[PDB]
Each structure stands twice: as C-alpha cells, then as structure tokens.
Design a protein around this ligand. Structure first.
Ligand SMILES: C=CC[C@@H]1/C=C(\C)C[C@H](C)C[C@H](OC)[C@H]2O[C@@](O)(C(=O)C(=O)N3CCCC[C@H]3C(=O)O[C@H](/C(C)=C/[C@@H]3CC[C@@H](O)[C@H](OC)C3)[C@H](C)[C@@H](O)CC1=O)[C@H](C)C[C@@H]2OC
Length: 113
C-alpha cells in the first residue's frame, strides 16, 4: 500500500494478522524525520486501543497495521498524504510531515501477544 512502508524489526507469531474491522491493541512511538519524538504510548505507559481499517486512525496505520502479525515489532513510515497532510495536527505535528512510528502489535480482538 503506497503511502506507507512497513519495516519488520522483530517478528510476531507470523499467523494472526489484523483484518478490517478488528480491534487492535498497540504500543507506539512516533517521530518526525528530524528524529524527534512527538508522541509515545510507551512513555505514557498506557496501551493504545482502536478499531483498524475503518478510518478511526490515519490511513498509514489502517494500511500498515494489518501487515503485521500478533506480537510483531515494526516501523511504519508514513507519507504526509497518509498522515495528517497539509494541515498537520495542531500542537503536535507540523503540516506536510512524514511520520515514523515504531509499532508493537500487542492484541487483536480476543488474542494477546
Ligand atoms: C478525544 C480526544 C481525541 C482522541 C484521542 C485519544 C483516544 C487518545 C490517543 C492516545 C491519542 C493520543 O493522545 C495522546 C494522540 O495521538 C497522537 O499524538 C498520535 O501519535 C497519532 O498521530 N496517532 C495516535 C495513534 C494512532 C495513529 C494516530 C491517530 O490516527 O490518532 C487518531 C487521530 C488523531 C485521528 C485523526 C482524526 C481527525 C482526522 O481529520 C485526522 O485525519 C488525518 C485523523 C486518534 C487516536 C483518534 O482516533 C482518537 C482521538 O482523536 C495524535 C497526533 C493526537 C492524539 O491526541 C489527540
């Protein structure tokens, strides 16, 4: 999927992958391309929970996360068009920003890594 690239860092179980409509549990760290963190669920010590593939989150997550298996650690590199685009996200992300997320897939529906 063109606006997002996934780099596997450590494999999950290689069997359970999120599908459109699933609810996933994720720990993440987002950085801008200058290397600076803009947000982290890890530092916040709270897991992030959301439906995937239904537009609840940026396109880059919706298209990137279903490519990971349960337990996988990856990096999702997201073009502005698949992120917050020209506007950015007021108070956090400048307009026209590539987003780089470290993502750990901790849960899919009832299943847990
Ligand atoms: C009631 C409060 C808000 C409510 C916030 C929470 C549940 C708390 C939860 C931990 C979010 C974080 O709170 C510390 C914080 O996460 C960021 O820092 C971040 O790392 C980020 O980019 N994420 C979060 C992880 C998934 C990818 C992306 C996202 O898709 O986030 C989603 C997002 C912003 C979608 C927009 C929606 C508007 C569209 O126009 C735009 O389309 C381009 C896309 C978030 C999760 C929404 O679904 C839910 C919310 O908005 C945002 C920079 C701002 C966000 O706080 C606001």
């Amino acid at each position: 999927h063109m606006g997002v690239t996934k780099e596997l860092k450590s494999p999950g179980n290689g069997v359970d992958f999120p599908k459109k409509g699933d609810f996933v549990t994720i720990h993440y760290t987002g950085r801008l391309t200058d290397g600076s963190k803009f947000d982290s669920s890890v530092d916040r010590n709270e897991p992030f929970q959301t439906q995937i593939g239904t537009g609840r989150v940026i396109k880059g997550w919706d298209e990137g996360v279903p490519q990971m298996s349960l337990g996988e650690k990856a990096v999702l590199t997201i073009t502005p068009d698949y992120g917050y685009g020209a506007r950015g996200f007021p108070g956090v992300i400048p307009g026209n920003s590539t987003l780089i997320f470290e993502v750990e897939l901790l849960g899919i529906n009832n299943k847990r890594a």
